[PDB]
Amino acid sequence: SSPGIWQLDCTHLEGKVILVAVHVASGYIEAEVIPAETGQETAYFLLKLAGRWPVKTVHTDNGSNFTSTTVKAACWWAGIKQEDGIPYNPQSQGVIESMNKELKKIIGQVRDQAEHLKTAVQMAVFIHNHKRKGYSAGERIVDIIATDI
Amino acid sequence: SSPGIWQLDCTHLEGKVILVAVHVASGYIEAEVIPAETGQETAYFLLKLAGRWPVKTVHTDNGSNFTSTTVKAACWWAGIKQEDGIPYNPQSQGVIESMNKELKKIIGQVRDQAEHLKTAVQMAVFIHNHKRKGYSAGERIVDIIATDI
Numbered sequence: 001s002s003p004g005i006w007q008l009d010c011t012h013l014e015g016k017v018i019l020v021a022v023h024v025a026s027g028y029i030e031a032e033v034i035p036a037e038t039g040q041e042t043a044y045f046l047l048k049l050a051g052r053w054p055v056k057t058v059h060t061d062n063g064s065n066f067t068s069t070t071v072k073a074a075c076w077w078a079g080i081k082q083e084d085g086i087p088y089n090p091q092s093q094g095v096i097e098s099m100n101k102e103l104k105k106i107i108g109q110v111r112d113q114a115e116h117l118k119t120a121v122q123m124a125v126f127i128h129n130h131k132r133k134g135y136s137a138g139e140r141i142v143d144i145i146a147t148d149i
Numbered sequence: 150s151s152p153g154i155w156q157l158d159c160t161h162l163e164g165k166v167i168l169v170a171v172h173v174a175s176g177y178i179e180a181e182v183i184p185a186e187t188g189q190e191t192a193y194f195l196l197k198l199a200g201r202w203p204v205k206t207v208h209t210d211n212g213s214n215f216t217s218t219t220v221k222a223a224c225w226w227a228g229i230k231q232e233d234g235i236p237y238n239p240q241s242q243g244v245i246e247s248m249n250k251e252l253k254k255i256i257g258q259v260r261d262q263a264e265h266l267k268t269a270v271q272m273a274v275f276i277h278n279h280k281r282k283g284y285s286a287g288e289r290i291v292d293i294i295a296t297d298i
């Protein structure tokens with residue numbers, strides 16, 4: 001069920017880790033800066049995400065998070081089906097890679113407005129989700145999920 | 150425009166601060182634990198919120214946040230109209246008070262499942278937004294905003 005499918009994406013900048021969840025059908029994202037991509041951090045991020053949107057399936061970003069007992073506990077708690085993130089579809093790699101490049105571009109454009117990286121990352125989330133491409137990612141996720149209800 | 154109206158709410162537990170944003174028309178919430186309710190914390194919370202939902206108007210929770218230059222900078226950045234939160238409607242007090250009591254109840258019911266308060270708070274956000282009252286708050290916010298688009 002495509003309205004409920006999200007993909008985890010971990011990228012790096014300034015020696016820090018940016019964890020992104022992408023709503024695959026819309027391109028809508030949520031993101032956070034973390035010190036390191038641990039099971040505990042990923043678990044907490046997923047718990048927050050699933051309290052905010054109806055997350056049914058998550059394609060995890062790597063095998064360590066797929067294996068993590070803490071990540072599995074969070075997915076159990078929150079009613080999330082944890083899946084691998086193997087791009088059986090090859091264009092899935094390229095779409096994420098492109099989004100990572102785009103996000104890093106936006107972060108660069110705002111970086112001086114922000115004292116801390118986490119502020120710049122949330123500015124980038126804002127700009128990404130509002131950008132009209134015609135509809136915005138925010139508009140698309142709401143339409144997709146409303147129709148599903 | 151009722152689809153875009155949110156209310157800030159600050160409550161306390163275990164000597165810590167829980168900052169809540171309520172989508173007034175739906176009862177949907179986002180929340181975070183912070184060390185203290187500063188302008189900087191409130192500003193960052195609003196930036197995150199407005200990157201995730203179309204926040205047009207925020208009724209701030211007190212006069213210090215209403216006055217804060219950092220909160221005003223975030224509202225300017227994110228396109229949010231900052232208003233006072235004076236309950237011209239007297240039932241507004243009681244609805245927030247009730248939600249605070251309900252949230253604290255849920256936190257108590259999950260508290261032992263969570264090592265840290267922040268995990269319990271996000272479990273409570275999850276339970277609150279999914280609770281069927283008949284529709285859930287999550288269902289209502291999406292319907293309200295989809296109709297508005």
Ligand SMILES: Cc1c(Cl)ccc2sc(N)nc12
Nearest residue numbers: 129138139142200201202203
């Ligand atoms: C900007 C935006 C977000 Cl971030 C999320 C949902 C919606 S619905 C709409 N018209 N705009 C949005």
Ligand SMILES: Cc1c(Cl)ccc2sc(N)nc12
Nearest residue numbers: 051052053054278287288291
């Ligand atoms: C559980 C939930 C949330 Cl937290 C937010 C939006 C929606 S729409 C739907 N059917 N469920 C939800």
